[PDB]
Amino acid sequence: VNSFSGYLKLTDNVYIKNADIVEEAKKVKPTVVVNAANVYLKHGGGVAGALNKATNNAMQVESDDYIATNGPLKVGGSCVLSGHNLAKHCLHVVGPNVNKGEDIQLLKSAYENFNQHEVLLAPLLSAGIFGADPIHSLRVCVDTVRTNVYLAVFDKNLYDKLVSSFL
Numbered sequence: 438v439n440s441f442s443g444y445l446k447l448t449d450n451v452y453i454k455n456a457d458i459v460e461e462a463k464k465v466k467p468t469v470v471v472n473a474a475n476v477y478l479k480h481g482g483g484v485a486g487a488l489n490k491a492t493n494n495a496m497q498v499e500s501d502d503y504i505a506t507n508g509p510l511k512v513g514g515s516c517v518l519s520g521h522n523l524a525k526h527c528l529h530v531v532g533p534n535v536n537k538g539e540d541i542q543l544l545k546s547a548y549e550n551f552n553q554h555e556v557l558l559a560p561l562l563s564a565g566i567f568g569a570d571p572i573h574s575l576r577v578c579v580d581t582v583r584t585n586v587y588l589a590v591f592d593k594n595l596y597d598k599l600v601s602s603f604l
């Protein structure tokens with residue numbers, strides 16, 4: 438039993454809700470919130486900009502030190518950093534950005550990072566400003582993640598579309 442509330446159950450382990458991931462994380466304080474990151478951990482817009490704003494830029498400060506030490510992530514890769522005031526940990530995961538010409542096949546590799554954590558609050562990877570089809574992202578999530586994932590969907594029209602179209 439966990440403190441996630443109001444989610445629709447899609448499968449044994451995947452749950453979905455229309456919610457602002459920032460407001461969700463503040464309420465639940467999950468062990469892990471997933472950020473829709475880029476390889477430079479530059480949290481400018483989308484989920485990343487919103488999460489970083491909610492940390493008063495502490496996420497960006499921590500991320501800049503991470504990059505200075507370790508260099509960029511790989512597309513499809515991840516790193517675990519602090520969750521600041523939002524969660525215990527933030528799993529920064531880089532899905533492919535179609536608006537940069539990146540290989541959508543790497544979306545499965547991106548979701549594989551979730552399997553290293555028993556429970557996560559997450560957005561749909563590569564959706565929104567990353568330019569992939571969200572129906573596809575949900576399908577890859579369901580077919581790749583085996584741990585318990587609570588998906589927050591920002592856009593109500595898309596939330597309704599993902600449920601009604603879910604197979």
Ligand SMILES: OC[C@H](Cc1nccs1)Nc1ncnc2[nH]ccc12
Nearest residue numbers: 458483484487560561564565591592
């Ligand atoms: O796939 C990620 C998703 C993509 C979008 N598509 C249409 C509108 S935003 N973005 C978000 N998802 C959840 N919480 C969020 N807070 C801020 C952004 C955000």
Ligand SMILES: [Cl-]
Nearest residue numbers: 483484565566
């Ligand atoms: Cl977005």
